[PDB]
């Protein structure tokens, strides 16, 4: 059987380490046995082909310039001007730390941001920069550590981990690996794979990476890693060492629009073959953004411009009746359908009992409508929508301020003995956990008991305390990008956050009219439509 | 059946993209048409009718109840009893280099294996790594570059 | 199968004792079949590999030179010169640590203190001195004995508790192993996790460690265990048998400054491979200490000097124009951006219903403002924070004292008919037995029902006896350190802690002003803007 | 969704003939016949609101008019999605009248006439409006 000869010459083919060479030759001289029963040459054959084809001693040339990378990051979406700098910082430290202190250093760049924004693109830009190759590996639903480690060389039909498939696809030893969705692993079967990730991840324990299919542990000691995420709260503590957060925030609609013209819509029109035939005036791109997507980034716009490209190709195919096909913001619906969303959220028309909190889920910021019903009763405080007592303390504290400040806001002097509250909070357990929306509930309860309408398109965030001082929250950037994606102009913030606002890059600020306050009394001054 | 008024619009749109092809326009980013429905609303008639309207030879090869990379792939080509997968067996049953192949109920997959064969699906179903497609019983790449697909299901959740 | 030809060696190539050969027979009964989907035999041979590769008969070079240990610990974190004397006299007394031996005590050498100090690295330096090996794992995130005892070895997925795994990850059979956060567990599954630690507890009870997974017991006798906890409020009582407590308190600002000069900076510079091309002045270092980090460890200084190193790396990469940039305290916002905390706490401006106490948290005693809402009502009391009820009865004592001292401060004689109270403590859920905010809450409620302002920057603590006397508490050192560093000067301590005043160096005692008081009327004359 | 329906109703005990308190006295037992719908969440809010009001007033619900939607704590009937699905289900089972949110006239236009040509859709905005349809026998 010349398959033995093929296995032998594939050992003769590829370079390999010393113990790998000895184990491969002595396992090569186990052959000439049962093909068909307990298959004593086939599983060894597949085992030897795994031990020959996997790349040893083969390398990509690498770049050692940062300015090249600064150009290539100013060609992706818009540059973003802000978090290309962090990637420069880590890559800069990687340039200097090559003089033999590479080990046990160097976090692995968790890149946190809502799904679809330029993360995989960022890996593309970096791998373009360095003359590396590229791969992706998705880690949603991995529970077996032997999906990460090898799995036992027992019978034919046994296969190694994710990571050695991926290191087998490339032909060199030094790729880039975008570990997709590292915060979504499970462990209900044997083995908790977070420990295997700490085996993979650390630059001293990568080098002895545990392999159950292979004998010899592989060397991840040259694989540049990079790693996605969506939420820091599902990220554990042992992974949280050797990770510098790179905070990818949401986009702004002017950044979205120039992202369309410079980078989205020519790629779509190059897709469906209409090259140089249809054009879109930019008011129509604004019609598309402001009315046919509510997300963070470049998924909604990719779908909408795809459907425009296809419908245009069909309409062209039954006659070529124009010179160019221009499109205004009026005949987008011909290509796409009914009005889904409102133009701005100024079409929102003040309610009686409902407040509008800025909030940030870790997969895209949003509004919340906290809804309050003052029903006749005894004085309970029911908080549905999956809440702990941090929200209950916030509600009790805002009600305590009202118990201090009845007459200032047109209320009965005794109501806490007689009026039950039911409170619906649509998912108020989201990160930035606990209250970052205390003033929201203050205006909500003031609205519901005051019987006076709470305005809309004035949407805020922050904490309160018992005397009624509005305390500063952290992370004003994410909350303002929520207010800026969801089509809101007017924001109210604590006065103690006016040190944060001056670090905000001017795209984010200059659409918005910030009404800085310092009391609960001041948001009940602005936000209510009559003053009670 | 009666026209359906709405799906054959979208099918003409997808085919209108397949018009603007056939050069070395490398736009192989191509969605592969997950048809979705209840039990029995006229899917395989759409498959047959498209294959007739394009003069191609329709051939179902269903993939319901799968958890193995051996329905798709070969075996130990060392003893009598080694056989290729459902695809090259289908391309033996049908005999054209450019068929239409209605894969069937692809949301009935399962998992009693280390590795869902959804990745083994993902080798053939891409327009790129179809072009090197080889089973264990095979040696040389049989391409599927000319082989138009279509795929039903019953729920997009699973 | 073919693996039995190797596994017949694997039991008699590993040095195994007689009961180990007995458990080898116990597994060998279940061996010697076909492995065609055999879930019991799979975990049988897996447990067999656990039996083989875990080592035997390997003692260590374990040196016993006291001034050697002292000289290794002369480089430790800063010295601290007392608690290293405690450990040096541990190893100077202990010829009993399985050397010259009796059955008298085997203490466990517990540590409780700041989360960020080098008590872990003290354990590292200990293992360097003992010349044994090291491991660590968190006992935080433990609620179960499935992590200590293995699973029920009767089907596939029975895996050992990770103590056996960690002893597999030591090639010899008497190392020193660390446990971390021993005191953060819950009685949830498989009974008490502390019951498993009671089986581990005594040095001959762990010699017979049986499991749901092991059958014939494993040796745990020679391996020195030591813990590392950080809660300063409770101690678990079933471990009080055979225990030696070694505490570590916080620091002074200038000691942290010295630590930044000594050890932290050259490591942060060598993480970015700089050759010391960047100097920071101690003026600027103390500015970093004041304005940025509020901790009693070296975590914050570690990361922020990491930031300065990395920013300096990226600036130096864009051109070589330097021999040194001695960075001063003004262009630190060139690198670190905005500084968060203030050197100035003269901006405090006495509020109506507040106080500012010194609590005893599991990072040490710190500052916490306690907020009070006196509302009209029905004489009630509510706490928030889900406190230790020493806060509740301290509120009881404070209220009864003010009911005995109504007219002398100007209070209305009735308030338990008309006024409810809501009391927020930020973190008084500690098991600090006794309030460390008794007179704090007393001051606050007197200020609140007074409707008179309450001066800040006067950090007070202790308890209230029911006879109007200020009861003493311990742990005075860390709280005086916290009030020193946070920008507070006036202290209100009991008289009956006067020998604890001896227990601190005069740098703590020459930035402050400690008032021995014992009548509560004295301090309530001291704080309010009216003299009563 | 059940408690939201009760919240609306507790605000509106005058209008429907309920006794002036009823939260103190009546335990509520709910049977939802379905095993596991891949549609999760309340696509049947005013379904439960009508069931609850008809039960607590002991007055029969007309089992002739199909309905769907979501609810909210004052009666603001939110819109729902998948209207082609629910209308095809409402006409395969031989029902001819469907109650929908008033936020679904813009959704009630893109459908083929093949589907809209049996039904008589009667759009409403508030929970009081579905209780004007389905509560004929007030005595």
Residue numbers in the entry:
A (entry chain B), C (entry chain A): 243 to 774
B (entry chain C): 319 to 476
D (entry chain C): 636 to 774
Can you provide the manuscript's text about this entry?
The Lon protease is a AAA+ protein found in prokaryotes, archaea, and eukaryotic organelles. Lon is involved in cellular protein homeostasis by degrading damaged or misfolded abnormal proteins, which prevents these unwanted protein species from forming toxic aggregates. Lon is known to form a homohexamer; each protomer is composed of multiple domains, including an N-terminal substrate-binding globular domain (NGD), a long-helix domain (LH), a three-helix bundle (3H), a AAA+ ATPase module, and a protease domain. We show here, using cryo-electron microscopy (cryo-EM), that the activation process of the Lon AAA+ protease may involve a pentameric assembly and a substrate-dependent incorporation of the sixth protomer to form the substrate-pore-loop contacts seen in the translocating state.
To provide a comparative context, we also examined wild-type MtaLon in two states: without any nucleotide (MtaLon-Apo) and incubated with 5 mM ADP (MtaLon:ADP). Additionally, our cryo-EM structures of a series of spiral subcomplex oligomers of Lon determined by 3D reconstructions suggest a sequential pathway for the construction of the THT. In the proposed pathway, the THT is formed by sequential incorporation of the protomers, beginning with Ob1 and progressing in the clockwise direction through Ob5, and completed by the incorporation of Ac6*, whose binding mode is dependent on the substrate.
